Amino acid sequence: SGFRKMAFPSGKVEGCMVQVTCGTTTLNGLWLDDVVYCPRHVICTSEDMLNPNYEDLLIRKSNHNFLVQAGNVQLRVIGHSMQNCVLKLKVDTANPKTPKYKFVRIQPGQTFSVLACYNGSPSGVYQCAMRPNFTIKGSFLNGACGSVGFNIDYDCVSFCYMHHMELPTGVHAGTDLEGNFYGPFVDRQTAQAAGTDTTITVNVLAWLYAAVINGDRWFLNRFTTTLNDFNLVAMKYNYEPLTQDHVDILGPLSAQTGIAVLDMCASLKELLQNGMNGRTILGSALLEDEFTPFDVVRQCSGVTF
């Protein structure tokens, strides 16, 4: 028993981190086989970042201008190209620690682990959700760019995020590993802001199931609701609409606990309308929305990699 915010084991990703320096700008890169992936603004000076023409800046670079270091070993760069907001450096050595991997683009509401790195070296690992406004609530400093987010499935690392920038209120934005931003953001140092966020309803429901599994059942009421009636009530509280796809994904937790999804919805509705009356659920005084249904099943069933 117990329920904690839990990251994937980071070792397979640690074996892929390198540092990339161009001029006096240094950030992190991801070394998979004989390619290093990193944010394209490694080619910018501080002044360039205010309004960069990345294509122009990259024209003026050649392979040898990129100093790629894997530990204290320099990796010779033998080619380069830009794909959207990511630079791809071909090196003459394939990474022997390359895991089985995929590049995926995740959906708002899905979670992933972040290996926060500086100068090619890992600092820590934490779990994040892609918010509905396409930011993540991360923890990043100067030099963190190129840190990646990922999920693991058995032996396969699915990379889904590369870190690029911090937005007002201390939230974070980046790209998939093809260099395409999540959300309407651009990699330029000019005023940008995320839109209003929303609460990930299906994840709150997943976490209420986690609570029941752990014996924290006080909030279960005796009622049911329709999906329509739930979504009308949830809308007022800035909860995203619960879809039938969401109901279907909650099925395994529903079947395990014997609580119908729409009965859980009736209990959540009462929590939204009435509050928690000073009580906690799984030790939290707020409803938690950064555990997916699969996160709950992995943790409570002991899925390994």
Ligand X SMILES: *C(=N)[C@H](C[C@@H]1CCNC1=O)NC(=O)[C@@H]1[C@@H]2[C@H](CN1C(=O)[C@@H](NC(=O)C(F)(F)F)C(C)(C)C)C2(C)C
Single residue of 32, 77, 130, 144 touching a copy of itself by CB under 8 A: 144
**Structure tokens given for 152:** 């693991």
Nearest to 97 by CA among 189, 16, 218: 16
User: Is 252 an interacting residue with respect to a copy of itself (CB under 8 A)?
Assistant: no
Identify residues 124-163 at the interface with ligand X (CB under 6 A): 140-145
Is 41 among the residues known to form the active site? yes
250 binds, among ligand X, a copy of itself, none (CB under 5 to 8 A by kind): none
Identify residues 4-43 at the interface with ligand X (CB under 6 A): 27, 41
User: Is 96 an interacting residue with respect to a copy of itself (CB under 8 A)?
Assistant: no
Q: Say which residue the tokens 């509705």 belong to.
A: 269
User: Is 44 an interacting residue with respect to a copy of itself (CB under 8 A)?
Assistant: no
Q: How far is the CB of 303 from ligand X (least distance, A)?
A: 16
User: Is 304 an interacting residue with respect to ligand X (CB under 6 A)?
Assistant: no
- Find the distance separating the first CA and the last CA of the chain, reported in whole Å: 20
CA-atom Rg of the chain in angstroms: 22
Q: How far is the CB of 85 from ligand X (least distance, A)?
A: 9
Q: Say which residue the tokens 């590369």 belong to.
A: 162
Q: Say which residue the tokens 């760019």 belong to.
A: 145
**Structure tokens given for 244:** 């039938």
Instruction: Please give the DSSP secondary-structure letter assigned to residue 181.
Output: B
Q: Which of 145, 160, 172, 265 is catalytic?
A: 145
Please name the amino acid found at residue 112. Answer: F
Q: Which residue, 103 or 305, is less far from a copy of itself as judged by CB?
A: 305
By CB atoms closer than 10 A (0-12, 13-18, 19+), residue 160 is: buried
Tell me whether strands 73-75 and 111-118 are parallel, antiparallel or unpaired: unpaired
- Is 182 strand, coil or helix? coil
Single residue of 8, 54, 182, 207 touching a copy of itself by CB under 8 A: 8
Q: Which residue, 90 or 137, is less far from ligand X as judged by CB?
A: 137
41 binds, among a copy of itself, ligand X, none (CB under 5 to 8 A by kind): ligand X
Q: How many residues bind a copy of itself (CB under 8 A)?
A: 53
Q: How far is the CB of 288 from a copy of itself (least distance, A)?
A: 11
Contact between residue 182 and residue 195 where contact means Cβ atoms under 8 Å apart: no
Distance of CA 112 to the CA centre of its chain: 4
User: Which letter, b or e, does each residue of 207-220 get, where b requires 16 or more Cβ atoms within 10 Å of its Cβ?
Assistant: bbbbbbbeebeebb
Nearest to 178 by CA among 81, 98, 261: 81
User: Is 99 an interacting residue with respect to a copy of itself (CB under 8 A)?
Assistant: no
Piece of the chain touching a copy of itself by CB under 8 A; list 72-80, 139-147, 217-225, 237-245: 139-147
Piece of the chain touching a copy of itself by CB under 8 A; list 36-44, 68-76, 109-117, 188-196: 109-117
Active site residues: 41, 145
Site for a copy of itself, rule CB under 8 A? 1-12, 14-15, 115-119, 121-126, 128, 137-144, 166, 170-172, 214-215, 280, 283-286, 298-305
Site for ligand X, rule CB under 6 A? 27, 41, 49, 140-145, 164-167, 172, 187-189, 192
